[model samples]
Target: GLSDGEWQQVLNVWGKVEADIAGHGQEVLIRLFTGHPETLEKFDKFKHLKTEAEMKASEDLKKHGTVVLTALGGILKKKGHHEAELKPLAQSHATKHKIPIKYLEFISDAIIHVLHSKHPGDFGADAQGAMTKALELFRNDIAAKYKELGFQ
Candidate 1:
């Protein structure tokens, strides 16, 4: 039930994690928060829901998959300014290479991170668990697709 400002504050943690993972293999701290309008809509949910509710929800996030797409702004900038920031440099090195970065959901948080949202927390369905699951599913699909393409 966090406001736009508060939601960004929480989501910022995840953004940093994604950035870290992309820049280096070093995983950063990420706590999940769902954009569920109902659960967070009720004022009491924000008030009565203790820190434990949020923490427990985060722990539950493990069942859901994870996806980390470089922010497009970051990607484009990297493509132009710092091509070395990303590993493959698809647009640069792979212009003729048809295979793009796989499983990049357009509406995903990674994209939203580029241009901060007005209601910053407007993300995927479900609470923390479902959001995590969606990302996890996407990540797995991408990983598997790459494997099929001989990504070893």
Candidate 2:
């Protein structure tokens, strides 16, 4: 849970996220796929994309990135109670989505990078720390789900 001041820091950044969910979100996906080719391979629909141009041009990539951003919104809205909400989503990723837990961990870095590059003034040290800490909790919660499902 965040202290009163820290929560405002998160909420302030969240406001920026709310404005351009699609743009920022898709860039985050592009970053994840670019930074980690294996994560690109994990997506059955997207793994075939070899060139960076193909990835950038992909409508499916945009759609999935929006989905990822939407999920992040929920995670932000409910801090302490977020684990319960994350459970079903994490379980689905483990089972139906066929995605492993560590990839979500990769998304964590992409977010900080995206925000920092997009909003250097708005995302200074305090906000970056808050975002990092928030994602750390998110990583912990989802990783627990992976463990619960008997995978690493």
Candidate 3:
């Protein structure tokens, strides 16, 4: 739960860095896959990639990373009012991809880390707290669907 002021900070900070959405996404994805290399196995396209450099260079990574960050932008655009829109994506991750919840957790942490790294001054504790809450909302809502669909 963020105070209205904190929410405003999120919008302001995110606005400052949104133009680098693709880069942010790339960094987060790279960190995630690199940290948990086995996780890449979940993505058929990336499963064959043996090195971090190879994974980073894949077109699949570029496309998926852009989609991921774009989706984050959409969720943050209205202070999380668009969370209901995540159901379809949640279903796809749960049912189609069978993605483990740990991946979502890693992505959230990586994104937060990258946000702070990219804008240390703008993304101070208050902004980080707000962004964390926003991501928690996404995770809870999305995980509910994953549970409903019997996915771990």
TM-score of each: 0.25, 0.92, 0.88
Error of 1 at 106 (Å): 11
* Model 2: CA > 4 A from native: none
**lDDT tens per residue, model 1, 72-139:** 33433222233344344333322333433432332344334332332246443333443344344444
Q: How accurate locally, in lDDT, is each candidate? A: 0.36, 0.84, 0.79
- Per-residue accuracy of model 3 over 19-108 as CA lDDT, tens digit each: 876677777888888888877878787788788778667777877888888887787776767657788889888888888887888888
What ranking of all candidate models by TM-score puts the best one first?
A: 2, 3, 1
Give Cα distance to truth, residue 129, candidate 3, Å.
0.5
Model 2 root-mean-square deviation: 1.5
Write the number of the candidate with greater TM-score, choosing between 1 and 3.
3
How many pairs of residues collide in each model? Answer: 2, 0, 0
CA displacement after TM-score superposition, residue 136 of candidate 1 (Å)? 2.0
Best by lDDT: 2
RMSD of each: 15.0, 1.5, 1.8
Better TM-score candidate (1, 2): 2
By TM-score, the best candidate is 2
In candidate 2, what are the lDDT values of residues 14-33, reduced to their tens digit?
Answer: 88988988888889999998
Superposed Cα RMSD, model 3: 1.8
